[PDB]
Design a protein around this ligand. Structure first.
Ligand SMILES: [Zn+2]
Lengths: 147, 397, 48, 133, 397
């Protein structure tokens, strides 16, 4: 038998010996083994927490904010345009294990409408977004000799 | 075959011993056995039907094992299991039924269906277990050249036969002497009549006899024997032996005299009872012989004397009779009886699916016809077919 | 403390591999500047 | 009174929206409301009946909440719940019936029973909701 | 089955709460549920039809999801959705209809079609939600088993029956006494007639009685009871009991005397009303017994006296009657009533697709025949079939 974590472990070895604990206990602790299914990726491990604890850790499992990942999705995190702008070449080279997993970017729009009172801050944004821009706008070339 | 059996006690001792609650180790020795099965299966494909109105269903396997854990079985454990059993249930049904129809002459005792012919395969034997179901217990012992039968009831050994034999008759049928009877199931009623009331008979006694030959030996039979044949104690108008006319029977009943019942085996008397009415034991026999007499009453009150004149017309017909019923018995061959549903199950499945008459069984699995000509082939097929019906009834009734 | 009411079973997945940044896997070159084209398709910068 | 109402749409919109399977989030807004109740209750004893052929059944409270953890409800979740609802069902019945007979000439519009007179209490109004019936 | 349900409240609470405008929030708890479905589906091939005039459309599944990256739903969002719903709509229709015809004696209470037999599968149960549709609410409670129940306006409990019983008659049919009635749907009209106006009757009173046995118990019934049977208050020429001739009925109406209505349950009086006309409550009954009398008027004006002579010919026939109508009631079994379209939906789909008569339902889903012999099998099939009709009506009317 293989079990959950340290605390889980301790407890068992502990009670196992407090003589006054139903012969059923030893049994259960005993023969009860983990669950290891290679294919699929299933792992049902025997555990022990507490009502309020299971409560926690549980939801942490049922909310593993981790979606899959196909060459296709990578391709897609890309503006509908550009791909349709011949001037630019696209291609794949690395493969993708059915192990792939990413974290949603969460891009819900404005949510907060500051663009209608918080001038002070917009100015600071614009400024920012602006410098940002200059950093990108490619430099020019082949000009006409100043002189 | 034996394979088949397990598949069930597996499920019963399953759909029964597995319920929201029970502690862990009450199913350890069980769970195991179960899984073992699943494995052997998954991968192998099956087919049933293709005969009469029998749905040709296709079956596949690919089911997970278990979460051989949790102490006091949590509800969630059950449901994820029942859903996997209900495929085996609805399966086996379609399996039994498929091999519960095919008949084979030469060697009919063996498996027939494309479903079962694959089960007797070797890679499957990894399953057999708990053969305490009376029928399998007996199937095995039979493949081992050995003796042992089944416990029956108000058994069905006598093919229906209702007739008479006139030992003395004449065209007018006004002074007959003979016997009439009804042999059916586990019962025999026979009456001996003498219109003349033995007026000219030696010692004023007319002897009667009724012999019934069983198609199979019955052992350890508990039998009720009673004087009188109520069935032949009332006025009747009967067809003549040649069917050309009808005669009148107007019985008056007297006690059967010198009653002797013999239960014989191969011509030898095994049990004999002289005038013993009530419960008697016949331990091993293939023939029953009932002998009884009508003795003209030596002393008669006027009312009685008036019924029996010295000369014709004979208007009151002296009759003596016996009734014999086999309450229970053991037979080395399968038979229909008053309690088991085997015959009815086999007959019912065949009727429901419009199964065509085959080369072995009489049309409609007719019992009288079957027992009348109970050939080795019919018996081997009947046993195979009865054993399957019993396997099916463990899950589907 | 009652044991059985505290013991739970665990549904946990098995062996991922988390990726960040992303993009990178994007192999991409570019035509030679002298051959540009707008939604137009005729060509941007066409005054030879 | 209004109290009473809730106690039901609570159960209906309950014994109805809780079936082996459903993805949690169809009830998050529901589960909550539910629990809230249990709390307010537990600890207060109740009495019903006391006339004609109306049994005098007594009631008590002390129940565990409802793990709002899981993402998809497993059968086991249901049963451990239905067993707790069937006490409220068999309860409410005995409650309705009790105030569905008493009458008053004066204020025959307000509550009467020793069961309801205690419901209109303030510490209970922490329940009202979905009055579309 | 329960599966099926969801598939709808899914779409309704969908095609309804999803429109150009609203804030996401209204559907967060909704969107989710939705998607979950799509997943479970995609990849499974489905077949519908294969009987009578029922197309055999096959369906494949390969559909995208629903971004949750928005606040206010832009028109563009809708259309890209409606187009995906309209495949589920046109689907479900073809699904309901397919299992809204097949019937099975053994297990009629269960699923049949190759479409549904696959739905009860386990891997699909991941959907079920919002079971407040009166019918499903009742389907469930019936499988765990308990006090189920429905609501009906002018229910349809009485098989059509229009006849008479002559308690006193003679060849000329000139001095009859008896009753005639019409039991149909939720109504009963019964008249008691005595051509002699109780001239020679004890206390000059003729007693009448009409008993109607319901095929199912009705509880919480609101009933209208009125004196007189208008249907039997006019002149008629009727066929004799043996069909050999015709008699003349020329009624004159008197108030029914000593009216007593009893609503019995298993032979016990549950409710009894003495001469109470108007609205009465019958809380639980399987039988209605109406007793009423014709009492010869002790005092008569000349015009009245002239109608009732001491000797024949009796030309004006004294008649008393009652009318009883069940406005509403609750029944533990599904029934047709005056408001629900279930029976009509089932009957209509079968008629439109020329569905052959099956082994359970009477030809044409005939209500009178159905309720007259309302066997357990017919009820289980009817409930299954009515529940499906109700699921269908949430989307398709
Ligand atoms: Zn018996």
């Amino acid at each position: 038998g293989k079990v959950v974590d340290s605390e889980t472990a301790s407890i068992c070895d502990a009670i196992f010996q407090d003589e006054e604990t139903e012969g059923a206990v030893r049994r259960f602790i005993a023969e009860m083994r983990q669950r290891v299914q290679a294919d699929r990726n299933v792992v049902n491990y025997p555990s022990i927490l507490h009502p309020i604890d299971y409560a926690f850790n549980e939801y942490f499992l049922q909310h593993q904010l981790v979606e899959p990942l196909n060459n296709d999705i990578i391709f897609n995190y890309i503006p509908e345009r550009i791909r349709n702008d011949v001037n630019y070449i696209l291609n794949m080279d690395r493969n993708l294990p059915s192990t792939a997993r990413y974290i949603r970017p969460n891009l819900l729009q404005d949510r907060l409408n500051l663009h209608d009172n918080f001038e002070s801050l917009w100015d600071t944004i614009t400024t920012s977004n602006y410098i940002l821009a200059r950093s990108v706008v490619p430099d020019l070339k082949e000009l006409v000799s100043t002189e | 075959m034996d394979v088949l059996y397990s598949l069930s006690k597996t499920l019963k001792d399953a759909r029964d011993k597995i319920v929201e609650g029970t502690l862990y180790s009450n199913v350890s020795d069980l769970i195991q056995q179960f899984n073992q099965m699943i494995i052997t299966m998954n991968g192998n494909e099956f087919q049933t039907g293709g005969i009469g109105n029998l749905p040709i269903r296709n079956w596949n396997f690919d089911f997970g094992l278990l979460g051989t854990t949790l102490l006091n079985l949590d509800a969630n454990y059950v449901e994820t299991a029942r859903n996997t059993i209900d495929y085996f249930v609805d399966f086996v049904d379609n399996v039994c039924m498929d091999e519960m129809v095919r008949e084979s002459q030469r060697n009919g005792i063996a498996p027939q269906s494309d479903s079962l012919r694959k089960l007797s395969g070797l890679k499957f034997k990894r399953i057999n277990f708990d053969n305490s179901s009376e029928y399998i217990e007996n199937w095995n012992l039979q493949n081992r050249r050995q003796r042992t039968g089944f416990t029956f009831h108000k058994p069905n050994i006598f093919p229906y036969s209702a007739s008479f034999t006139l030992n003395r008759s004449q065209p007018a049928h006004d002074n007959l002497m003979g016997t009439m009877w009804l042999n059916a199931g586990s019962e025999i009623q026979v009456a001996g009549f003498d219109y003349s009331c033995a007026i000219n008979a030696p010692a004023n006694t007319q002897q009667f006899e009724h012999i019934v030959q069983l198609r199979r030996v019955l052992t350890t039979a508990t039998i009720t024997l009673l004087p009188d044949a109520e069935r032949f104690s009332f006025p009747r108008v009967i067809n003549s032996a040649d069917g050309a006319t009808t005669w009148y029977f107007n019985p008056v009943i007297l006690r059967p005299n010198n009653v002797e019942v013999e239960f014989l085996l191969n011509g030898q008397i095994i049990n004999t009872y002289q005038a013993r009415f009530g419960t008697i034991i016949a331990r091993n026999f293939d023939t029953i012989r009932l002998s009884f007499q009508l003795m003209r009453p030596p002393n008669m009150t006027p009312a009685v004397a008036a019924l029996f004149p010295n000369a014709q017309p004979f208007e009151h017909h002296a009759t003596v009779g016996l009734t014999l019923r086999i309450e229970s018995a053991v037979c080395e061959s399968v038979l229909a009886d008053a309690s088991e549903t085997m015959l009815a199950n086999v007959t019912s499945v065949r009727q429901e699916y419009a199964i065509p008459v085959g080369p072995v069984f009489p049309p409609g699995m007719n019992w009288t016809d079957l027992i009348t000509n109970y050939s080795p082939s019919r018996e081997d097929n009947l046993q195979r077919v009865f054993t399957v019906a019993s396997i099916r009834s463990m899950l589907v009734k | 403390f009652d044991f059985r009411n505290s013991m739970h079973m665990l549904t946990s997945n098995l062996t991922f591999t988390v990726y960040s940044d992303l993009l990178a896997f994007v192999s991409a070159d570019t035509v030679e500047p002298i051959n540009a084209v707008a939604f137009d398709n005729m060509r941007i910068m066409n005054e030879l």
